[PDB]
Amino acid sequence: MAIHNQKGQTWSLMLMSLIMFIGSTNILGLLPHSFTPTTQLSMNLGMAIPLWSATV
Amino acid sequence: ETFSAISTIGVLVYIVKKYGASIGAFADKLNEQKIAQLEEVKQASIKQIQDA
Amino acid sequence: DTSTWFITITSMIMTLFILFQLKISNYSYPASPESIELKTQKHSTPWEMKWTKIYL
Amino acid sequence: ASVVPLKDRRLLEVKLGELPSWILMRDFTPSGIAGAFQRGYYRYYNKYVNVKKGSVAGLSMVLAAYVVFNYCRSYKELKHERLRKYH
Amino acid sequence: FQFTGIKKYFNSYTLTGRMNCVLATYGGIALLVLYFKLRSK
Amino acid sequence: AEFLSLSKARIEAYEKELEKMKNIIPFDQMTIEDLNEVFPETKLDKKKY
């Protein structure tokens, strides 16, 4: 929140949902036989491009 | 090949040690949260009575 | 492994961002609670000023 | 069958972690203050004793369920078993 | 009711955020080269 | 006597406000909407910090 300080603060309530999902789905997989969805390269090319081109 | 099953369950035993201090932080958060309302009700009460 | 073909996961990621924007949206900020004590002080002070103008 | 699986989690929450507030549940909230963690305790040996306000046995049962649920899918691939049993 | 809790949020930022068409075009073209290499084996 | 006329209801409305203020605090773990009278809420993008 502190860096932006604009009327671009509306966007920041989403960016803390983005940190809890890949914060969790990278921490679940350390278990014995679990499976991480951020291992496959498919969804990460759907996490970058609909967010990166939402900026330009 | 799951001797790394125990070591991801062994590290989660060492955090149960600090979890007995996490009750204070968790407990501490609740108490800290509790003090604010108590201050607020008292603060609210004095202002209303003296304005009358 | 080098997996392939990608028609999978990425359509099942945006259904997840209907969940995480539902849970995390109902949170509470400690700071908002310090703001409601300020406007209650100025209102009765102006009401006492409305009572002081009822004297003067 | 939706009211069947939804009444499973609302039974495995309000008993063993953590039974919240919002009166009409106020004495139901302190029902978790003693907690059923004393009921959940006896499975390991004694050692996870820190469950008082950071409750281990409330959480560490789901993660023990998600491991043995994922042991079933892996079983077909890593067969390895001879015409016998192990030690 | 998985809509009106977050419907005020959507038409705010999906004006730029809901541009998955570029993901759809870069995805749909990425479908084409893999069916083609298995066609020529 | 207009102060004795107009502010007399302002005294009793403040006196009745002390009655309902006792009602709201209640149990420690009481409610998430009954505590939403004194401490405020607003429309979109009010709380800056």
Curated annotation (Swiss-Prot), chain A:
Q: What does this protein do?
A: Subunit a, of the mitochondrial membrane ATP synthase complex (F(1)F(0) ATP synthase or Complex V) that produces ATP from ADP in the presence of a proton gradient across the membrane which is generated by electron transport complexes of the respiratory chain. ATP synthase complex consist of a soluble F(1) head domain - the catalytic core - and a membrane F(1) domain - the membrane proton channel. These two domains are linked by a central stalk rotating inside the F(1) region and a stationary peripheral stalk.
Looking at the record's lineage, which domain of life comes first? Eukaryota
**Where does this protein come from, organism-wise?**
Sus scrofa
Portion of the full sequence shown = 58 to 113 of 226
Describe the subunit structure: Component of the ATP synthase complex composed at least of ATP5F1A/subunit alpha, ATP5F1B/subunit beta, ATP5MC1/subunit c (homooctomer), MT-ATP6/subunit a, MT-ATP8/subunit 8, ATP5ME/subunit e, ATP5MF/subunit f, ATP5MG/subunit g, ATP5MK/subunit k, ATP5MJ/subunit j, ATP5F1C/subunit gamma, ATP5F1D/subunit delta, ATP5F1E/subunit epsilon, ATP5PF/subunit F6, ATP5PB/subunit b, ATP5PD/subunit d, ATP5PO/subunit OSCP.
The protein in question is named ATP synthase F(0) complex subunit a
| Gene this chain is encoded by | MT-ATP6
| Similarity comment: family membership | Belongs to the ATPase A chain family.
Cellular location of this protein?
Mitochondrion inner membrane
Q: Kindly list the residue ranges recorded as spanning the membrane.
A: 11-31, 40-56
From Swiss-Prot, chain C:
The keyword Ribosomal protein is assigned to this record = no
Molecular function (GO) terms for this protein are: proton transmembrane transporter activity
Post-translational modification N6-succinyllysine, affected residues: 50
Signal peptide residues are none
Q: How does it sit in the membrane?
A: Single-pass membrane protein
CC per GO annotation? mitochondrial membrane; proton-transporting ATP synthase complex
- Compartment(s): Mitochondrion membrane
- Keyword annotations from UniProtKB, A to Z: Acetylation, ATP synthesis, CF(0), Hydrogen ion transport, Ion transport, Membrane, Mitochondrion, Transmembrane, Transmembrane helix, Transport
What GO biological process, any one, is recorded here?
A: proton motive force-driven ATP synthesis
TM ranges: 4-20
The chain residues annotated with the modification N6-acetyllysine are 50, 53
Assembly state and interactors?
Answer: Component of the ATP synthase complex composed at least of ATP5F1A/subunit alpha, ATP5F1B/subunit beta, ATP5MC1/subunit c (homooctomer), MT-ATP6/subunit a, MT-ATP8/subunit 8, ATP5ME/subunit e, ATP5MF/subunit f, ATP5MG/subunit g, ATP5MK/subunit k, ATP5MJ/subunit j, ATP5F1C/subunit gamma, ATP5F1D/subunit delta, ATP5F1E/subunit epsilon, ATP5PF/subunit F6, ATP5PB/subunit b, ATP5PD/subunit d, ATP5PO/subunit OSCP.
Q: Which family does it belong to?
A: Belongs to the ATPase protein 8 family.
**Biological function:** Subunit 8, of the mitochondrial membrane ATP synthase complex (F(1)F(0) ATP synthase or Complex V) that produces ATP from ADP in the presence of a proton gradient across the membrane which is generated by electron transport complexes of the respiratory chain. ATP synthase complex consist of a soluble F(1) head domain - the catalytic core - and a membrane F(1) domain - the membrane proton channel. These two domains are linked by a central stalk rotating inside the F(1) region and a stationary peripheral stalk.
Q: In its UniProt entry, what is this protein called? A: ATP synthase F(0) complex subunit 8
Full-protein residues shown here are 5 to 60 of 67
UniProtKB/Swiss-Prot annotation, chain D:
Tell me how this protein assembles: Component of the ATP synthase complex composed at least of ATP5F1A/subunit alpha, ATP5F1B/subunit beta, ATP5MC1/subunit c (homooctomer), MT-ATP6/subunit a, MT-ATP8/subunit 8, ATP5ME/subunit e, ATP5MF/subunit f, ATP5MG/subunit g, ATP5MK/subunit k, ATP5MJ/subunit j, ATP5F1C/subunit gamma, ATP5F1D/subunit delta, ATP5F1E/subunit epsilon, ATP5PF/subunit F6, ATP5PB/subunit b, ATP5PD/subunit d, ATP5PO/subunit OSCP.
Keywords assigned: Acetylation, ATP synthesis, CF(0), Hydrogen ion transport, Ion transport, Membrane, Mitochondrion, Mitochondrion inner membrane, Phosphoprotein, Transmembrane, Transmembrane helix, Transport
* Name assigned to this protein: ATP synthase F(0) complex subunit f, mitochondrial
Phosphoserine: residues bearing it = 2
- How does this chain sit within the bilayer? Single-pass membrane protein
Q: Where in the cell is it found?
A: Mitochondrion; Mitochondrion inner membrane
Per the UniProt record, which residue ranges are transmembrane? 61-78
Query: Which parts of the sequence carry N-acetylalanine?
Result: 1
Query: What InterPro entries does the annotation carry?
Result: F1F0-ATPsyn_F_prd (IPR019344)
Keyword field contains NADP: no
Give GO BP annotations, semicolon-separated. ATP biosynthetic process; proton transmembrane transport
Q: Which stretches are annotated as coiled coil?
A: none
Family to which the UniProt record says this protein belongs: Belongs to the ATPase F chain family.
| Function text | Subunit f, of the mitochondrial membrane ATP synthase complex (F(1)F(0) ATP synthase or Complex V) that produces ATP from ADP in the presence of a proton gradient across the membrane which is generated by electron transport complexes of the respiratory chain. ATP synthase complex consist of a soluble F(1) head domain - the catalytic core - and a membrane F(1) domain - the membrane proton channel. These two domains are linked by a central stalk rotating inside the F(1) region and a stationary peripheral stalk.
Q: Which residues carry this modification: N6-acetyllysine?
A: 15
Q: Name one GO cellular component term.
A: proton-transporting ATP synthase complex
